[PDB]
Amino acid sequence: TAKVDFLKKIEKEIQQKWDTERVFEVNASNLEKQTSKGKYFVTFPYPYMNGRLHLGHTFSLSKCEFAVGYQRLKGKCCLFPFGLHCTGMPIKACADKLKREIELYGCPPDFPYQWGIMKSLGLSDEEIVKFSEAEHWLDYFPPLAIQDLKRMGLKVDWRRSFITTDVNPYYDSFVRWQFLTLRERNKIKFGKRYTIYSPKDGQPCMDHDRQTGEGVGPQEYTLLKLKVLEPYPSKLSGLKGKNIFLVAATLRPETMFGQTNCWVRPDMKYIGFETVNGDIFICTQKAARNMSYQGFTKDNGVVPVVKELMGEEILGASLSAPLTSYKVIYVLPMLTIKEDKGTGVVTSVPSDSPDDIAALRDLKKKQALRAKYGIRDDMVLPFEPVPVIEIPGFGNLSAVTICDELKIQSQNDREKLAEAKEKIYLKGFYEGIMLVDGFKGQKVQDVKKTIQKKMIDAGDALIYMEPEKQVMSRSSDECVVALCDQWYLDYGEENWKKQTSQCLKNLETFCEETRRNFEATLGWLQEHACSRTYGLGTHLPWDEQWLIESLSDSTIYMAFYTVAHLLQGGNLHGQAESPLGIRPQQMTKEVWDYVFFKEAPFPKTQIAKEKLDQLKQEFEFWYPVDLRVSGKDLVPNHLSYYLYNHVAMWPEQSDKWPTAVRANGHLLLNSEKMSKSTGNFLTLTQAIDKFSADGMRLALADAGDTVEDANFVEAMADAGILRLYTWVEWVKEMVANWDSLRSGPASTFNDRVFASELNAGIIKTDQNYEKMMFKEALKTGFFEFQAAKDKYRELAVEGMHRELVFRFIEVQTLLLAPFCPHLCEHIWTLLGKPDSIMNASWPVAGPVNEVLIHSSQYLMEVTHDLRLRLKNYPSHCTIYVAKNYPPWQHTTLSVLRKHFEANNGKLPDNKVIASELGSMPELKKYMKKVMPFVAMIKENLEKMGPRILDLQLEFDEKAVLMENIVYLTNSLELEHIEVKFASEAEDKIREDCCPGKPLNVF
């Protein structure tokens, strides 16, 4: 267990060496004169300071942190800067729940959590409360973040970090410029528009301030008024005097000629209220409150409630329903009503919505429904479905003529009502044909929008907006609002959308689906609700009631990095003396136009011209964004707005558009999800404490590198630190016993197989590092290097040669330094090599002879082969490697070799087999082991290439064992393992065994 500590000491040792050495401060005036290879720029989606950083952030980043700890050891520059989001509410949210959960209850509260994990963080109770105002959140968290990274030891120029609210006056200048530019280009606009909106927040709550439904929007429905005729039912008494209409939502309004009644759920609570113009509306409150914030009531947002009840009390009185050849229809119960979607009412469209015929039919069957709630001689019976839409497989009575053949007679078939409403679903959007007196033959799709708008002008119908599913901001469930005010951003452009689809067809998607989620969300993304009024953030330049919502003031932010060290040099809040000496007051809109837009004129400035070209040079050298990477949940929203924008201010400049991004899955701790709510979670500061960040870094590079859910498992970060500590002591020990390593040359065989393994490994390792799939590059360069170093200490019984033993620890201590820098710098220094290790390069992959490795992956095959047939039955073993080409085996290879060397990469008949393998007196009683093993050539030949046919088989098998048996006495744990030629075999294994399947009997 001291293993964890030993690392933990030298990690902070080599850190306070690195940091006092200032190793990562990549400047662009001193490292641009050196014409080296080309830059490498790695940017992270800067997390909020709404709380200590978590593994889900560390894995979301480790893909880049390693990347640069490698792409530097290939000679490329490495600007890995790091931002710090403070905009957006989510800070104003957890501590506002702190400010009112400390308000109405004692300090701390009494019950029968939100405060309790600000004290389960540990703070002596007093400190915890200064949190409820936002400004102490932002004086305290950007520290804990940067300390946990200094301690993770990440390759990050310090002087380029910051804060993103108005707190930091400098970035604010950067945000203000962006928007004065983005307003100049008629990319912003003002309007009164529908948006997901937090009642209780006072602003349209859209994307990164939600609990449910990151990618969710308004759904539109038509709403119908349903004149309720007297006799009203019992509870409606007092309101004699006003026009009352039941309100429901259908999405096939072409169908409403098919109205035959009106459905509500007898045991749902219903509300009725008066609009602004003064008539009476009965929906649920989710519906009511939704209408309200949509200007539907007198004062925007208020529900003028007049009475309450449940549908029980409603069933009965006739509803006169517009557009239907049944004007005196009634309200009937439908207990299967989705109790959230819609109004709490639905329509009765029996001829194109099967539930309804099920609904109708049951009321017609049992008198245990036929008088159920006020159901007279007329109620359900003479109502029959309405032929309005014919669909050319089945009938005008479509939704019936389908469930009267799939026989959904019972109304309790809700799975089989998943059957039903999927039937007349959308096919009935085109094949369905309107038949009414006025559209006979018209396509239901080209008249959909007309029949609906005919019903608005007739004052019979209006238009309803509802949450597609549900949201929780952090609290009160949200709503489409007719927001009477919102500055918003125009992602609905025709031009800008197309030039940006092209910014995507350029930018590199690390996979084949990520692009599909960028198409499907771009061809989906309309204009955006980008202005908050309460929370935290920066204020709009010209209308300062408005603050900027998070997901938009965080889009071009990457260029501040390029100049941050000089526009701030370390004070995140932006109050220390900015290194170059710019007054935050002296960064006019056009001196950004200068520093960023290349051709844009040198402005009349009261700062001399030195710093002006120097901050632009920084920019001009560092940009573009090479590779950014974050979780797969900022694919539809933030990374997206991050593509539009980077076009929007350089719509001309092709070069600076982000060129490559990367998204992973979420992370799992021990194969299960990571929500504090579970107990399966670790803040970065503790993963480190427990596992020696190098040890952690390990389990992350093994987290999986794919976009599908990448898992992190505690144990393997433990076994991590162990194979690490056995290494260091081995490397310690193998430099003590220098006097133990062979003189002369490195000439023996075991030597050369390890030595070509070694270089086989360095390149294998190289190929996956180039391709940033860190797990598979882990496997190649660490697991495969241990086993092959073990196994060449295994078979060098005359001593491991030192000049192979040393160039091997060089390469590994290197190969591994991107994964685990301090421990490698320790080793590299341990060797008494001079410079810090980050001043090393990519080691030279020497000359490789893979026919040597062929043998290596042949013995690992049999190593893996006989580990198997020992399960049944067990100590000794003699292994017959068959003697030679039998007169029936040589010949197979011989004749097939003949055809092959004459047929251009395609092989003959599968019954040509029979005529050729059959018609051979050489094959008179052994074709039954040439035809079952003429599939030994069409099964395992792609396995290697043109190998098992080219007769001579470039290595003696008998003897690449008889050498391995020491390691193979291990790895099979037997005692002795001899090998006979199948010359002294039982002849059931001489004249049977295929070289490549060596047979073996205990």
Ligand SMILES: CC(C)C[C@H](N)C(=O)O
């Ligand atoms: C730039 C931001 C939208 C990033 C996001 N808030 C995160 O925690 O990763």
Ligand SMILES: CC(C)C[C@H](N)C(=O)O
């Ligand atoms: C989906 C529902 C709200 C409306 C649909 N026209 C129906 O069959 O009832």
